[model samples]
Target chain A: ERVAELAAEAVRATDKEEVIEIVKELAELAKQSTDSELVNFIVRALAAVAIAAQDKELVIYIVKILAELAKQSTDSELVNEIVKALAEVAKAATDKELVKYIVDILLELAKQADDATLVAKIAEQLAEVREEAKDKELQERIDRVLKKLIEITLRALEESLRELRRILEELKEMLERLEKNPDKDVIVKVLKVIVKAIEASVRNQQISAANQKALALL
Target chain B: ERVAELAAEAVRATDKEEVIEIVKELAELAKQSTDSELVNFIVRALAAVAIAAQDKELVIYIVKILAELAKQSTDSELVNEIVKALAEVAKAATDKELVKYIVDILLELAKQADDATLVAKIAEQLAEVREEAKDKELQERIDRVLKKLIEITLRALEESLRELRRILEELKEMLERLEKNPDKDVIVKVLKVIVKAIEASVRNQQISAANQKALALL
Candidate 1:
């Protein structure tokens, strides 16, 4: 009940520390409810705090909640908010590891996201991350994650056509990202990965006609 | 008339040398028209040719025409296509100095852009260029251009409220770009510049209530 009261007051609270404390409690309390308004409130409230304080830990906390909830709810609005919020966070994030971890969660969610926009937004953030990362390790990590995303997307072509479309949309998003900061080596690596992923999957009998069409277009 | 015909035929033409010849001729033709349907067609045709051939001279030539035309045209669609086409060129650009020159042109236009979206898109491209640029000299150039943009924006504030709004919108776009790749030093420099821009403008009698209000929000 104390946690619930804090959750209720979280949005109106002006103090960063007070709001942060409220969110910390709410994350636990909201975790227990089957249908809680607190879930959405906490998400939005944390997002606001994340922007205001510009805290990496705060943004990461909010992202973790959204990633978990994203799989359970088909709410496009929630998904979009998560994508937009993370994009904002990625724009400001300083910690290489934190951004990498955020990308890790986003990649996992991208695989499950039915909304093409969500996956596209994820690609947008990843692309930004790839561009801004000063550390060599982080750059390599982003490339590997994106390569894995493409590989997973190709495999999904054999399962669900809708998923295939979502993956294709994500690929377009990735291309947009790559197109803006075109390095010859990175572009070549991406091209090779896509071609290899398609070739390896072509032998699988479950590959759909649509999959072949997409491959042919490639 | 022959130039227009060449421009029309340019889209379907596959030969790079032929495409180059047609664009050279079309530039002269397109220059005379106050309003021509061929303007957009030439822009798109050049963009397609730019991507397909990935020739530096070809992309630079197209950009020069678009840059000149964009300044004269109130057509947002044409302006956006120009921005997008150049961004594509920037992505695949192999010549470092060429990309830097493109950014210089973009920075100049960004200051004059009445359209908030146009300025925002320019910042988007600048952010990408800043990220991809490996040369120390190019990085210094980008920093200098941004500093100049901020200085110009503040000066524009005391001229006209409409001009002030446009400048402020461009500043926000620059801020958005800087935020994504936050270096502590850079972030501090940007904040200092914004604060100074507002402070300097505050002393001007011509500064309006709306200007003060916007400054206060900042």
Candidate 2:
């Protein structure tokens, strides 16, 4: 009777810590439950708990749950969220071995995360790794991890750029629509588009320069 | 008469403020001293007063007197002493804007400095302007004022480079003499000379690049 009342109160709790305690109880239920809704509720609850928990050990335990869910489920969003949580924990963590373990977990996700959004998230996580690994021993480890990530990101970027090039070429053909009209408004619009393109190119050049420097640091 | 003699004695006194008072009195009197010893004595006494004066306004006044001596008697040493006094005032001035004004005064003296020693002193003074003008706007103003000074300096550097080229030409001629000689020892000396000349040219290239960059900054 007390457990049921606590579960009901969990839905109405005003305080975050109270809500977190309720969710932790729910997660235990989800871990044991055979129902898919129960299992998935546990996953969402752990995500909420991880976001709220100031306790590193509690967050790490929640990450372990998310890692298991990542293997059993095909939810790309959950995997990305898990990677984000683990990376945050690793950056704040002072334990060298724990950080290495976080890297290993990220690398495991990278294999499952070959999809477009997942690849981008992995690249973002690896970049954060570069920043967190300040010690010489950890720097070498981070460099190897970053190099592998860049190789993957470069391949993905090439594929994305190819699709973008095809679309741009078609737009150019339509924008040959300008060749017929030569209207002032059309000309102005075309110039604006070109300016935007140039600005984008400049921004990409800076990113490429930064990426090259980071690689060289390896 | 007794007061005047006491004042002269005070001019030779060790107390900085007392000596400054005596110099101010001598300036007001437009005192004439026939003895070179008396002139030297007063100039050196004023030099010490210039350094020791607690009042920046009074230091500026004494510096003006030293500057007048430079112009009237063409005493290069007096001009240098004046510039040095200005530099000392510059060091003690806590107000950054006021310091720039004093530095500007020194820069003008540097522009008029005619000989190598004086020109070098002038450049050294301007270098202080470069170091102190950490603010870009203030630096830009200092840079504009200093450009004329740099032009004079570049003319000097060009003349020096031309002399170096002439020396290099003479060296080449000497190398040609050894080149045609059948003596093995002379050939070995020629080889060593050629190597040293090549190394020096490489070093000069680096130095000239940096010099040009600094000049471009001005």
Candidate 3:
């Protein structure tokens, strides 16, 4: 009953302690709920206050609370709402540093995530910021984070490719050594190499011709 | 007369508006003064207030005003005191960012200096900060600014040396061209080189042996 009213009050409440007190009361009132509608509704109010307020400590507090909630929940939808609110900062606007603060939170969330769902969701939200942001300076900064996180993800994928390539190179060296000879013992050794190639393909996404080529060697 | 007292009052005054008002009043009261003892005394109060109060806007305001005053006065001792008080923040801290703000002012002062006197004076002041500042993080930032400013100074000196060396190398090339002749016309061209060598010595600090060697060439 009081959830929406309290949310409205928190947005209009200029006083820091007043908003905090109201949020706490609302927390007790909505201490826990279903439809998730209640929980996300509460975050929208927090984000509204953040967009309206213009500095660091308070912004960090609002973000840390939302992050703590996201970190504890396994629910993808819940974390998605929190990430969406963080992304929404670009449209309504906070000061530049404050926006950077939010970007940092998203980057860290992506870094600390246990699974790809949260990270990919954050990237999706950040992508929306590029178009929604009217300030060019703000937009440039937001894009830099997007570029940086994408780099981190791409690098991880490349590392996996490198390791798989290393295994294939080892098989090539085996052939170079045997340039002098091949038999049943060699066939068994070559079988092990074929198995590794197919498994490596599964472990790190592989090319069709190459995995088949390894079987041909066996 | 009232300068020292206002300084004391401003330091103890907690309100932002109050301290700014008091400082403005103090400035009007001391719109102008000499003995530099008076001028520097007022700055000590400003520094004390910065130390006692913690944050950015006020600290930047105090620094920019001091920098303006220093810029207008060629009096070395006066600028020296302003830089000294800025250095003094290491002792009575005004938070890390505020200290960086002060270090940045010193850097700009070094950059904008028309004569080495102001820049050298600033370097001398910054050297004191490395010892006075207790917080390692703050001290490190202060040292970084000091190092950066020193690098700027060293790079400028190197450029002068490069130009001077180029002139000497041009003389070497001239000798190669003239391997076939030495007459009155030759002496005149060589005389111009000697004059340039001597002028370069005066324009940029010169090596003792090189200037004399150039004179011997004449």
Candidate 4:
């Protein structure tokens, strides 16, 4: 409890190195904490350290914290907070190893981002780093990470498209039946649903294809 | 069954030389039987014949069936690959009108491709032909299509990147927490999920970014 309170205060501290010192100390205590609340508090403090820490090594140390979180934390709220902070630190850090570590760790944490938009958003940042890293070593590491990602995206697009096609085909069949039958109430309702789906599909196709093209470029 | 029986009878009676006649006669039947198994059978047959019938004088018809299919099929459902086949047929048809018609259809299909991968591919073709077309009018058409495609691709990439950044924030938070907890269950579930997602984000970011770079050439 004392460490948790101290870590929280440390996170809000305006002095940069002071905050870093507290975060490093909190990191040590976090390793030993059995209570989830204490762990959560310390983790949140570490996240703040990642974002607020001016020292590059301190930020880098947070990467190790992130890796530990990726390996051990079950509290989703804490998990997500840590991932977000790590992403910020990764973005801010200049150390290639640190960036790579943070990215590797961030990738592991992304799945825990409960919000779908949030999950996708993190993937985008990691991709940005991959694109930005022009060095052979960084590029090679990124490539190793990205191949898996490409498979996932391709699989997702393929599945989503299949579902979309199936939906459209069924609706078209229903439309034909309704045309022959011409029932106002029930058919109209069905048609409306199908029409809405068609509209969404058209929008989705427009978006997905464009995304694929941009995706191809990335 | 009745429609299929009658349509098959009519199709069988037409001379091989009278495919245009047979198809014209069966156009209504095809539309009416849109959901019929025969529809796909006829469409595929029609696409094949369109490929064979293409001539320099009527180049526009060279891949008409294929283009129609390209228009109707989902962008991700191997449709763009079919579009490549259709484009090949268009290339075979030497006639100016045929070329123009087919290119225009492709432009429409490209508009539908609005995602990253397919759009980039289409944009590539447009860029290829933009300077090659001998006639000023056709060249202008290619240029215009290329320009619009470039415009759309840029818009889509920017939008996708913004989404990626948001997701990264979430990943950061998750990483920080997992570090604090370091439990076996956390490793198996939440951390693993985030890792996969981060991989996806990075891949998508690379793809979108590359498309933007490609569009700059246009």
Candidate 5:
């Protein structure tokens, strides 16, 4: 109960200095405790406080604190909880380098982690961080142009790379004109069209070669 | 030995009409034979004749003869041999619509096939027939520019879509210049770099969007 009250103060702390004071007090509570669950409660509270900590260094410090608490226990669930909290911070933090740093630390700790499910969630967080944002217009334009090129090639009886290059050049000009307004969903779409339609064309060397150039421009 | 002698003559037949004559003789030989092994000898002989048949109609005739032979026997190996030959013709035949025609028939026949290994071989030829050829030059060019563009974005903290548009515009000009000359290996290369290095970059929306454009120009 005393530890719980201290954890409350950690979250309630107005400044970084006050949080540090509460953290030291909570760390003592965790170290002196014989009950693992009680230590877990303290660790969980510190995780929330870490998110509320906002400062990058302090967030990293709380992550390290929870990691140590995790090391002392043989419970897989306990370890996963700490890792999940770390992943949350990885997603929530605005600083790109800090989020990347936190993700690296979590991955390093995940090396010995036996849980596939936990490892996968950690990976999703990493991918979400990596994918940036979606550009629906770019995706739509790519589909529009490639499908047009595919239709031209389908209708052609020859290796007409010149006519096709002109089409792509025009598309390029339009994109350049868009000042390249600025794209994976497109990777999947390009591949699907290539596999489904482009591969279905008459000429192999021409289509694959032409499509190869098409895919690179994206 | 008698079946072998007859089979050899089927191969020896010159004109399409003479091959049809030998095929009729072979079908009679296959039908009246009491020994299953003798029938197999005749059917196997006919498969070779079908490949040598060259004439599309005669090829289909010999194939039907073999398909019936396959149906009468419960031998999985025999069925697979018939499928393998059909797939063989799907690759060897030069007539595009005829090639397309034979592939449809083979895919239909592959339906009841029990051998996973043989079915897989049929699928490979299908993909091969689909893949066209390697444009090593196109592949090399795509890698050259995307990796360059990747480096540009990697070093940038912001989404600089315009500079990339210009680089790609220049690349398009080079391709247009080369269009006077010509154009998956690149698909594999592009995806490999995208996953390995492109995803490794800082900006998400710009990188994926720019890469989407880069891939389309290929």
Candidate 6:
């Protein structure tokens, strides 16, 4: 929180060096912190600096950091916040290409996130941006952003389905092995794989209701 | 054909006024041409103008012409061409914001189109564009474009479903009235509504297989 506060101050400093100094500090702090709220604030602060600087390179840099954080963290709210900040950067950036780059980062983050709610939040945010886009060019970027979100989402769902199938296969193998040589390791493996399969089903519930129902039966 | 040829010439013309002049000519000819191919050329020519013109106003003007043509034309292929040209303009134009504006027009055109195949074609085009987007920012725009496509497609399907329901209700009422007093007018109305319902089902076959199955059951 202290680091986030300092980062916020850096965003307000108006001096380029001060912002860069804060960004460097945030990067270090981001590596050290497990606290989602702090990281969220750090992401927001960097995004603020990016928007204030109005530099495409800075925006891309900040978005990359956020994307990396999203990949490492399992917290849905943290990922959601990162996406929200990126959406602001996309909306505020004067450079249209920069806007696209930020969205791509968001797409990557969304894909990395295992939470369906996070993906839905990102989709909702993109939809909101599209609705607010009064400019023709920005609207076009927003259009692309929404489409990419769908593609990433569908791909993620496919990935989850594949994972589910792999887990099921493992479970089948474990069950077969148990018939001849029952062991504690086999039971633990079966339990773990079952848990993973359940998680996969939850994550991929959006893929199709019938698919989920079938999985539930299993 | 002559107007299309002239429009193409204007796209290659250096002067701003020349492009505008051709756009005007294309608009007038667009209204008169029953030939889908000629209109297709006109849409392409306008798209070319949109891409070539650095002038924001000129690009928007050209896009507007394409939009008007898209809205007025009923030919699925012609509408598809208009969408295709707009996609190119979005790709080729330097102005990122202008690309969004053109896509907005595409979304509107998608909503206006009654053909399920045309909607599917537009979705396919968006998917193609998303695949080709090399830049992160442009990829973002493509993402939004796909989402808008789905949104528009859903709305279109909903509109068709509503029409089907209205027809069904009318048919049900006619059947109830027929039990008491059979009338030729009532039977004709029932047949017309049934035909319309069938047409709606056929037109929106792209919505879902489940919907198609339900329609078959109906």
Best by DockQ: 5
Expressed as tens digits, the lDDT of each residue in A130-216 for candidate 3 is 666676887777777766665555554566678779888877877665665765445434434544543453333212211211111
Residue B23 displacement in candidate 2 (angstroms): 2.9
Per-residue CA lDDT of candidate 6, range B21-94, in tens?
77887788888778787777667667766776578888888778777877877777777888888778776766
- What is the per-residue lDDT of model 5 for residues A97-185, given as tens digits with 9 covering 90 to 100? 66656655655554444433334444444444444423454334334433444323322312333343333344334333332222234
Stretches of model 6 off by over 4 angstroms after superposition:
A1-218, B1-14, B52-54, B114-117, B165-197, B204-218
Q: Write the per-residue lDDT of candidate 4 for residues A124-191, one digit (tens) a residue.
A: 55666666666678767765555544444455556567877878777778776777776645444453
* Reference-based lDDT, residue B76, model 1: 70
- Candidate 4 per-residue lDDT, tens place, B21-126, comes to 5555444455534354555555545544555653333224435555655566553445555555555554544566666776777777866774667776766665
Candidate 4 chain A weakest ten by summed lDDT: A111-120
Comparing candidate 2 with candidate 5, which one achieves the higher TM-score? 5
Model 2 alpha-carbon drift over 4 Å, by segment: A1-218, B1-21, B24-61, B65-84, B91-105, B112-140, B146-152, B179-218
Please give the DockQ score of every candidate, comma-separated. Answer: 0.01, 0.01, 0.00, 0.02, 0.04, 0.01
Query: For residues A17-40, could you state the per-residue lDDT of candidate 1 as single tens digits?
Result: 776676676666656565545566
| Whole-model lDDT per candidate | 0.59, 0.56, 0.63, 0.58, 0.53, 0.65
B37-124 in candidate 3: lDDT tens per residue?
A: 7777777777777666755677677777777777766777777888888787644554666667778888888777654445655766
What TM-score does each model's chain B reach against the true chain B? 0.56, 0.49, 0.62, 0.62, 0.48, 0.70
Using Cα atoms with residue i matched to residue i, what is each candidate's TM-score against the true structure?
A: 0.38, 0.31, 0.36, 0.39, 0.32, 0.42
Interface RMSD of each: 25.2, 23.8, 34.4, 13.9, 15.8, 20.4
- Which residue pairs collide, candidate 1? A91-B180
**Number of the predicted model whose lDDT against the real structure is largest:** 6
Query: What is residue A39's positional error in candidate 6, in angstroms?
Result: 44
